[PDB]
Short mmCIF file of C-alpha atoms in Angstrom, two decimals:
data_model
loop_
_atom_site.label_atom_id
_atom_site.label_comp_id
_atom_site.label_asym_id
_atom_site.label_seq_id
_atom_site.Cartn_x
_atom_site.Cartn_y
_atom_site.Cartn_z
CA UNK P 1 0.18 0.08 0.35
CA UNK P 2 1.00 3.70 -0.71
CA UNK P 3 0.97 6.78 2.28
CA UNK P 4 1.48 9.55 1.63
CA UNK P 5 2.34 11.69 4.37
CA UNK P 6 2.00 15.35 4.19
CA UNK P 7 3.38 18.23 6.73
CA UNK P 8 0.95 21.25 6.60
CA UNK P 9 2.06 22.52 10.01
CA UNK P 10 3.71 25.58 10.20
CA UNK P 11 6.95 23.86 11.79
CA UNK P 12 9.15 21.24 10.58
CA UNK P 13 8.10 17.58 11.95
CA UNK P 14 9.88 14.47 11.68
CA UNK P 15 7.99 11.69 10.38
CA UNK P 16 7.83 8.22 11.91
CA UNK P 17 6.51 4.96 10.20
CA UNK P 18 6.93 1.79 12.13
CA UNK P 19 5.43 -1.47 12.85
CA UNK P 20 6.94 -1.78 16.52
CA UNK P 21 9.51 -4.48 15.90
CA UNK P 22 10.56 -2.94 12.63
CA UNK P 23 10.61 0.22 10.43
CA UNK P 24 7.93 0.86 7.52
CA UNK P 25 9.99 2.02 4.82
CA UNK P 26 12.76 3.93 5.76
CA UNK P 27 11.43 4.34 9.22
CA UNK P 28 11.49 8.34 9.27
CA UNK P 29 12.44 11.61 7.91
CA UNK P 30 12.16 15.26 8.13
CA UNK P 31 9.19 16.97 6.68
CA UNK P 32 9.74 20.85 6.37
CA UNK P 33 6.42 22.67 5.86
CA UNK P 34 4.85 21.85 3.21
CA UNK P 35 7.07 18.83 2.24
CA UNK P 36 5.10 15.32 1.05
CA UNK P 37 6.73 11.96 1.60
CA UNK P 38 5.50 9.06 -0.27
CA UNK P 39 6.26 5.63 1.24
CA UNK P 40 5.38 1.89 0.95
CA UNK P 41 4.19 -0.42 3.33
CA UNK P 42 4.31 -4.04 2.94
CA UNK P 43 0.49 -5.88 2.30
CA UNK P 44 -0.83 -7.83 5.23
CA UNK P 45 1.27 -5.55 7.68
CA UNK P 46 -0.42 -5.54 11.03
CA UNK P 47 0.17 -2.68 13.79
CA UNK P 48 1.62 -0.33 12.13
CA UNK P 49 1.67 3.41 12.88
CA UNK P 50 2.83 6.74 12.00
CA UNK P 51 3.28 9.59 14.03
CA UNK P 52 4.91 13.65 14.03
CA UNK P 53 8.20 13.96 16.37
CA UNK P 54 8.59 17.78 17.14
CA UNK P 55 11.69 19.45 18.16
CA UNK P 56 14.50 17.01 17.41
CA UNK P 57 18.01 17.73 17.05
CA UNK P 58 20.01 14.95 14.98
CA UNK P 59 23.80 14.21 13.85
CA UNK P 60 25.20 12.90 10.30
CA UNK P 61 24.79 9.61 11.46
CA UNK P 62 21.08 9.93 12.19
CA UNK P 63 21.13 10.06 16.27
CA UNK P 64 19.64 12.43 18.54
CA UNK P 65 16.76 13.46 20.50
CA UNK P 66 13.26 14.59 20.08
CA UNK P 67 10.69 16.40 22.48
CA UNK P 68 7.69 14.28 21.51
CA UNK P 69 7.92 10.62 19.99
CA UNK P 70 11.44 10.10 20.46
CA UNK P 71 12.04 6.24 19.05
CA UNK P 72 15.01 5.35 20.79
CA UNK P 73 17.21 8.56 19.65
CA UNK P 74 17.13 7.48 15.98
CA UNK P 75 16.09 9.68 12.70
CA UNK P 76 15.23 5.84 11.20
CA UNK P 77 12.41 4.45 13.94
CA UNK P 78 12.63 0.73 14.42
CA UNK P 79 10.59 1.07 16.84
CA UNK P 80 7.58 2.90 18.84
CA UNK P 81 8.07 6.64 20.09
CA UNK P 82 7.63 8.26 23.62
CA UNK P 83 4.16 9.76 24.26
CA UNK P 84 3.17 12.20 23.63
CA UNK P 85 2.02 11.16 20.45
CA UNK P 86 -0.82 11.19 18.24
CA UNK P 87 -1.00 7.90 16.36
CA UNK P 88 -2.23 7.35 13.05
CA UNK P 89 -2.99 3.57 12.95
CA UNK P 90 -3.33 0.52 10.33
CA UNK P 91 -3.75 -2.99 10.16
CA UNK P 92 -3.74 -4.06 6.26
CA UNK P 93 -4.87 -6.73 4.31
CA UNK P 94 -6.65 -8.79 7.09
CA UNK P 95 -8.95 -11.25 5.63
CA UNK P 96 -9.58 -8.87 2.74
CA UNK P 97 -10.38 -5.47 4.81
CA UNK P 98 -7.44 -2.50 6.03
CA UNK P 99 -8.74 -1.11 9.02
CA UNK P 100 -7.49 2.69 9.94
CA UNK P 101 -7.73 4.78 13.43
CA UNK P 102 -6.44 7.93 15.07
CA UNK P 103 -5.27 6.95 18.79
CA UNK P 104 -5.22 9.39 21.52
CA UNK P 105 -4.33 6.64 24.00
CA UNK P 106 -0.68 7.40 23.90
CA UNK P 107 -1.64 11.43 24.08
CA UNK P 108 -1.61 14.26 21.55
CA UNK P 109 1.15 16.18 19.96
CA UNK P 110 0.46 17.02 16.67
CA UNK P 111 -3.12 17.36 15.03
CA UNK P 112 -4.07 14.76 12.23
CA UNK P 113 -6.08 13.88 9.58
CA UNK P 114 -5.63 10.15 8.12
CA UNK P 115 -7.51 9.35 5.19
CA UNK P 116 -7.75 6.56 2.19
CA UNK P 117 -7.16 8.42 -1.43
CA UNK P 118 -8.90 5.49 -2.92
CA UNK P 119 -12.24 4.42 -3.37
CA UNK P 120 -14.62 2.83 -0.71
CA UNK P 121 -14.43 4.47 2.72
CA UNK P 122 -13.89 7.76 4.77
CA UNK P 123 -11.41 9.29 6.48
CA UNK P 124 -10.84 10.52 10.47
CA UNK P 125 -9.44 13.51 11.81
CA UNK P 126 -8.22 14.78 15.25
CA UNK P 127 -8.04 18.69 14.59
CA UNK P 128 -8.51 20.63 17.80
CA UNK P 129 -6.31 22.37 20.06
CA UNK P 130 -5.80 19.73 22.49
CA UNK P 131 -2.23 20.87 23.50
CA UNK P 132 -4.03 24.31 24.18
CA UNK P 133 -6.80 23.18 26.32
CA UNK P 134 -4.73 20.25 27.96
CA UNK P 135 -5.08 19.59 31.82
CA UNK P 136 -2.44 21.20 33.58
CA UNK P 137 -1.72 17.28 35.19
CA UNK P 138 -1.30 15.89 31.83
CA UNK P 139 0.91 18.77 30.31
CA UNK P 140 3.99 17.72 29.12
CA UNK P 141 7.23 20.09 29.54
CA UNK P 142 7.98 19.24 26.29
CA UNK P 143 5.19 20.21 24.46
CA UNK P 144 2.15 18.03 23.77
CA UNK P 145 -0.54 16.30 25.93
CA UNK P 146 0.10 13.19 27.81
CA UNK P 147 -2.68 10.64 28.28
CA UNK P 148 -2.99 9.65 32.06
CA UNK P 149 -1.79 6.06 31.63
CA UNK P 150 1.53 7.24 31.34
CA UNK P 151 1.39 10.20 33.35
CA UNK P 152 -0.06 8.19 36.79
CA UNK P 153 0.43 4.23 35.74
CA UNK P 154 -2.39 3.02 37.67
CA UNK P 155 -4.57 -0.15 36.44
CA UNK P 156 -7.59 1.86 35.92
CA UNK P 157 -5.58 4.63 33.16
CA UNK P 158 -3.80 1.95 31.70
CA UNK P 159 -6.79 -0.68 31.59
CA UNK P 160 -4.35 -3.44 33.00
CA UNK P 161 -6.92 -5.53 33.99
CA UNK P 162 -8.96 -5.37 30.86
CA UNK P 163 -11.59 -3.78 32.69
CA UNK P 164 -11.52 -0.05 32.79
CA UNK P 165 -14.01 2.74 32.14
CA UNK P 166 -13.88 5.98 31.04
CA UNK P 167 -12.32 8.91 33.22
CA UNK P 168 -12.50 12.58 33.48
CA UNK P 169 -8.88 12.43 31.37
CA UNK P 170 -10.14 10.13 28.75
CA UNK P 171 -13.42 12.63 28.24
CA UNK P 172 -11.13 15.23 27.97
CA UNK P 173 -9.62 13.65 24.85
CA UNK P 174 -12.86 12.28 23.33
CA UNK P 175 -14.99 15.77 24.17
CA UNK P 176 -12.01 17.41 21.42
CA UNK P 177 -11.58 14.38 19.26
CA UNK P 178 -14.86 12.09 18.94
CA UNK P 179 -13.40 9.86 15.85
CA UNK P 180 -10.19 9.30 18.31
CA UNK P 181 -9.41 6.43 20.68
CA UNK P 182 -9.67 8.09 24.30
CA UNK P 183 -8.51 4.93 26.23
CA UNK P 184 -8.13 1.28 25.46
CA UNK P 185 -11.75 0.16 25.85
CA UNK P 186 -13.41 3.17 24.20
CA UNK P 187 -16.45 2.28 21.52
CA UNK P 188 -14.38 1.37 18.34
CA UNK P 189 -14.05 4.28 15.84
CA UNK P 190 -12.03 1.92 13.47
CA UNK P 191 -13.01 2.43 9.72
CA UNK P 192 -12.72 -0.27 7.70
CA UNK P 193 -11.44 0.25 4.41
CA UNK P 194 -11.36 -2.23 0.94
CA UNK P 195 -8.21 -4.51 1.33
CA UNK P 196 -5.08 -2.97 -0.47
CA UNK P 197 -6.05 0.72 0.12
CA UNK P 198 -3.88 3.78 -0.44
CA UNK P 199 -3.88 6.40 2.43
CA UNK P 200 -2.62 10.07 3.05
CA UNK P 201 -1.70 11.00 6.69
CA UNK P 202 -1.64 14.73 6.84
CA UNK P 203 -0.04 16.83 9.66
CA UNK P 204 -2.28 19.98 10.51
CA UNK P 205 -4.59 19.14 8.52
CA UNK P 206 -6.54 22.79 9.19
CA UNK P 207 -3.73 25.13 10.50
#
């Protein structure tokens, strides 16, 4: 499948694309305002994610640090990023269907639009100013708005027993972005698309 990742933000992001134990395509790249990066993702890839990293500083070796989403200090991510990270999540060619969602379960850093560029399903978006409205206890000094599992490490926020309910923190993310997952047992906002669809992930889709 083809993903075109577009930075419409006024600031530079560092895009990342991984399935947890491996890079997807090159794994990461700098995107200046307006730039677009087209990657190829193997069919059948399950549990892929795409996210933005902010305020990175890297050397000529591809090694360094990002204030949000850092993936063990590497430009080219092989693993998932450190919260807070707004996530575009995808499972592809799963019994003939693709499944996509946006998730705030690991917090929010950058607004996002995640849509198919081929026919037969709708896209999803989380485009509200979550960072500006973030509750004081969930503010990340680095930038971003952390989820409450990251911040407090409780069974209830992390849904460690497999039973957990909505919380005052999950409801904050949900009020601002109804179409993203706000906690592990949220009513699914998954979109089912035809198998082998192609997609575009845009950062700051309205901004």
